Design an enzyme around this catalytic site. Structure first.
Site, PDB file in Angstrom:
ATOM      1  CE1 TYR A  64      -3.448  -2.864   0.653  1.00 45.32           C
ATOM      2  CE2 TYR A  64      -4.463  -0.842  -0.166  1.00 45.32           C
ATOM      3  CZ  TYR A  64      -4.509  -2.213   0.042  1.00 45.32           C
ATOM      4  OH  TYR A  64      -5.601  -2.941  -0.383  1.00 45.32           O
ATOM      5  CD  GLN A  98     -17.021   0.511  -8.019  1.00 43.04           C
ATOM      6  OE1 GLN A  98     -16.891  -0.698  -7.818  1.00 43.04           O
ATOM      7  NE2 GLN A  98     -17.373   1.008  -9.201  1.00 43.04           N
ATOM      8  CG  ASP A 101      -7.831   7.697  -7.590  1.00 42.23           C
ATOM      9  OD1 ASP A 101      -8.419   8.790  -7.695  1.00 42.23           O
ATOM     10  OD2 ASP A 101      -8.141   6.688  -8.256  1.00 42.23           O
ATOM     11  CG  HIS A 116     -14.758   0.317  -2.612  1.00 38.71           C
ATOM     12  ND1 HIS A 116     -14.502  -0.297  -3.819  1.00 38.71           N
ATOM     13  CD2 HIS A 116     -16.063   0.074  -2.337  1.00 38.71           C
ATOM     14  CE1 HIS A 116     -15.604  -0.883  -4.257  1.00 38.71           C
ATOM     15  NE2 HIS A 116     -16.565  -0.671  -3.376  1.00 38.71           N
ATOM     16  CB  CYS A 145      -2.338   3.830  17.012  1.00 37.20           C
ATOM     17  SG  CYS A 145      -3.567   4.985  17.680  1.00 37.20           S
ATOM     18  CB  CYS A 148      -4.131   2.653  21.814  1.00 40.45           C
ATOM     19  SG  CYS A 148      -4.467   2.160  20.096  1.00 40.45           S
ATOM     20  CB  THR A 186     -16.829   0.442 -12.665  1.00 43.27           C
ATOM     21  OG1 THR A 186     -16.992  -0.617 -11.716  1.00 43.27           O
ATOM     22  CG2 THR A 186     -18.185   0.816 -13.256  1.00 43.27           C
ATOM     23  CG  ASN A 211     -15.572  -0.351 -19.316  1.00 48.90           C
ATOM     24  OD1 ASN A 211     -14.651  -0.883 -19.932  1.00 48.90           O
ATOM     25  ND2 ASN A 211     -15.786  -0.563 -18.022  1.00 48.90           N
ATOM     26  N   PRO A 212     -14.087   0.804 -22.333  1.00 51.02           N
ATOM     27  CG  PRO A 212     -11.859   0.309 -21.959  1.00 51.02           C
ATOM     28  CD  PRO A 212     -12.969   1.200 -21.464  1.00 51.02           C
TER      29      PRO A 212
HETATM   30  N1  LIG Z   1      -9.118   4.514 -20.067  1.00 54.84           N
HETATM   31  C1  LIG Z   1     -10.214   3.906 -19.568  1.00 54.84           C
HETATM   32  N2  LIG Z   1     -11.432   4.592 -19.479  1.00 54.84           N
HETATM   33  C2  LIG Z   1     -12.585   3.984 -18.963  1.00 54.84           C
HETATM   34  N3  LIG Z   1     -12.534   2.663 -18.517  1.00 54.84           N
HETATM   35  C3  LIG Z   1     -11.333   1.960 -18.594  1.00 54.84           C
HETATM   36  C4  LIG Z   1     -10.182   2.559 -19.109  1.00 54.84           C
HETATM   37  N4  LIG Z   1      -9.199   1.673 -19.065  1.00 54.84           N
HETATM   38  C5  LIG Z   1      -9.729   0.534 -18.522  1.00 54.84           C
HETATM   39  N5  LIG Z   1     -11.116   0.643 -18.186  1.00 54.84           N
HETATM   40  C6  LIG Z   1     -12.095  -0.206 -17.615  1.00 54.84           C
HETATM   41  O1  LIG Z   1     -12.049  -0.092 -16.284  1.00 54.84           O
HETATM   42  C7  LIG Z   1     -12.640  -1.182 -15.732  1.00 54.84           C
HETATM   43  C8  LIG Z   1     -11.963  -1.454 -14.460  1.00 54.84           C
HETATM   44  O2  LIG Z   1     -12.469  -2.537 -13.847  1.00 54.84           O
HETATM   45  P1  LIG Z   1     -11.778  -2.893 -12.403  1.00 54.84           P
HETATM   46  O3  LIG Z   1     -10.212  -3.080 -12.543  1.00 54.84           O
HETATM   47  O4  LIG Z   1     -12.460  -4.203 -11.827  1.00 54.84           O
HETATM   48  O5  LIG Z   1     -11.985  -1.625 -11.421  1.00 54.84           O
HETATM   49  P2  LIG Z   1     -13.312  -1.455 -10.493  1.00 54.84           P
HETATM   50  O6  LIG Z   1     -14.660  -1.780 -11.251  1.00 54.84           O
HETATM   51  O7  LIG Z   1     -13.307   0.036  -9.972  1.00 54.84           O
HETATM   52  O8  LIG Z   1     -13.080  -2.451  -9.242  1.00 54.84           O
HETATM   53  C9  LIG Z   1     -14.005  -2.483  -8.297  1.00 54.84           C
HETATM   54  C10 LIG Z   1     -13.324  -2.738  -7.018  1.00 54.84           C
HETATM   55  O9  LIG Z   1     -12.655  -3.887  -6.994  1.00 54.84           O
HETATM   56  C11 LIG Z   1     -11.423  -3.752  -6.668  1.00 54.84           C
HETATM   57  O10 LIG Z   1     -10.978  -4.874  -5.897  1.00 54.84           O
HETATM   58  C12 LIG Z   1     -11.486  -2.570  -5.723  1.00 54.84           C
HETATM   59  O11 LIG Z   1     -11.851  -2.421  -4.470  1.00 54.84           O
HETATM   60  C13 LIG Z   1     -12.302  -1.817  -6.643  1.00 54.84           C
HETATM   61  O12 LIG Z   1     -12.667  -0.610  -6.214  1.00 54.84           O
HETATM   62  C14 LIG Z   1     -12.544  -2.204 -16.734  1.00 54.84           C
HETATM   63  O13 LIG Z   1     -13.781  -2.619 -17.048  1.00 54.84           O
HETATM   64  C15 LIG Z   1     -11.858  -1.607 -17.832  1.00 54.84           C
HETATM   65  O14 LIG Z   1     -12.173  -2.068 -19.039  1.00 54.84           O
HETATM   66 ZN   LIG Z   2      -5.176   3.435  18.301  1.00 57.36          ZN
END
Ligand SMILES: Nc1ncnc2c1ncn2[C@@H]1O[C@H](COP(=O)(O)OP(=O)(O)OC[C@H]2O[C@H](O)[C@H](O)[C@@H]2O)[C@@H](O)[C@H]1O
Ligand SMILES: [Zn+2]
Length: 249
Positions: A64, A98, A101, A116, A145, A148, A186, A211-212
Site C-alpha cells: 500500500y 470506488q 485515489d 471503498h 497508533c 494506543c 468499472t 468503458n472500452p
Molecule cells: N481509459 C479507460 N477509461 C474507462 N474505462 C477503462 C479505461 N481503461 C480501462 N477501463 C475499464 O475499467 C474497468 C476497471 O475494472 P476494475 O479493474 O475491476 O476496477 P473497479 O470496477 O473500480 O473495481 C471495483 C473494485 O474492486 C477492486 O478490488 C477494488 O476495491 C475496486 O474498487 C474495466 O472494465 C476496464 O475495461
Molecule cells: Zn489506536
C-alpha cells in the site's frame, strides 16, 4: 455522441456518476482487472483482506505504501477534469467512486463519495483514531497508533469487510433520486457498488456506460460508449457546455 445522448445529459434534472479504476488508468495507474490489472499480478487474497493483513502486516503495508506513492505522484487526467467541470456547470450533482485515489478531488470535484475508502486515510485497528497523510510512509517500521500504540492500517475497504453504513446509505439516496447516471471505468462485478446503477434504471432513470469493454451492466445501459473515459468525457462535457451556452436566457 448523438443528439439524443447529449439531450439526456443536458436536460437531466439530477445526474450522478459512478466511477471505477478505469477512470484513473489515463493517469498512469493500472486497473485491478483486465490486461495489466493489479489483481492479475498481485493476489487480492494476500493484499486485499483483513486475514492477510493480520498474517503479514508488513507485506500488506509495503504494497500500500507503494500504491500510495504512485497515486500521490500521479496527476488527474482529462476524465477527472471533465467530471469536475460537469459539476461546475451544475449538471453533475454527486460523484460516487470506488477508487481509493484522490484524483477526482485534485481535479476540482467537490461532492464525492468514496465507497471503498481512501489511500489518503490511515486509521487504527483498535481505537477510533484516524487521519490523512500528505505522503507515503516508509515500511518498515509498521505504522503505529500515537493514541494506543496498536497497528495502523490503510483507510480502505478490503474484501469481506463492510462498507461504512453511512457512506453506502448516502450513495443509495443519490442514486434513488438520479434520473441519469454515468457509469465510467468499472467492471460492474464488485458488490454492492455494481448494484447502484440498477437502482437508477429500476426507478425509471437512464444509464450511460463509458468503458472500452462490455460489462454485465452493458445489456441494460441506455447508452454504452466503447472508449477511454478521458477522450469520451472530455468530448461529452464540451458538447454539454456548448449546448447549455446556446440556451436563450
Ligand atoms: N481509459 C479507460 N477509461 C474507462 N474505462 C477503462 C479505461 N481503461 C480501462 N477501463 C475499464 O475499467 C474497468 C476497471 O475494472 P476494475 O479493474 O475491476 O476496477 P473497479 O470496477 O473500480 O473495481 C471495483 C473494485 O474492486 C477492486 O478490488 C477494488 O476495491 C475496486 O474498487 C474495466 O472494465 C476496464 O475495461
Ligand atoms: Zn489506536
Amino acid at each position: 455522441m448523438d443528439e439524443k445522448l447529449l439531450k439526456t445529459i443536458a436536460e437531466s434534472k439530477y445526474l450522478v456518476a459512478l466511477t471505477g479504476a478505469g477512470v484513473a488508468a489515463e493517469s498512469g495507474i493500472p486497473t485491478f482487472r483486465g490486461k495489466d490489472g493489479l489483481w492479475n499480478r498481485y493476489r487480492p487474497e494476500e493484499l486485499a483482506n483483513p486475514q492477510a493483513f493480520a498474517k503479514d502486516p508488513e507485506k500488506v503495508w509495503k504494497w500500500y505504501a507503494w500504491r500510495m506513492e504512485k497515486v500521490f505522484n500521479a496527476q488527474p487526467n482529462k476524465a477527472h477534469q471533465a467530471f469536475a467541470e460537469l459539476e461546475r456547470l451544475g449538471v453533475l450533482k454527486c460523484l460516487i467512486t470506488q477508487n481509493v485515489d484522490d484524483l477526482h478531488e485534485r481535479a476540482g470535484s467537490r461532492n464525492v463519495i468514496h465507497l471503498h475508502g481512501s489511500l489518503r486515510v490511515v486509521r487504527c485497528t483498535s481505537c477510533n483514531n484516524s487521519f490523512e497523510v500528505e505522503s507515503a510512509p516508509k515500511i518498515p517500521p509498521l505504522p503505529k497508533c500515537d493514541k494506543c500504540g496498536s497497528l495502523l492500517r490503510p483507510g480502505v475497504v478490503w474484501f469481506g469487510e463492510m462498507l461504512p453504513p453511512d457512506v453506502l446509505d448516502r450513495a443509495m439516496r443519490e442514486v434513488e433520486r438520479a434520473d441519469v447516471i454515468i457509469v465510467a471505468g468499472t467492471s460492474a462485478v464488485v458488490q454492492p457498488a455494481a448494484s447502484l446503477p440498477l437502482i437508477v434504471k429500476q426507478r425509471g432513470g437512464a444509464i450511460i456506460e463509458i468503458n472500452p469493454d462490455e460489462t454485465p451492466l452493458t445489456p441494460i445501459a441506455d447508452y454504452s460508449l466503447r472508449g477511454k473515459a478521458g477522450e469520451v468525457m472530455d468530448e461529452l462535457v464540451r458538447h454539454v457546455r456548448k449546448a447549455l451556452s446556446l440556451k436563450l436566457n
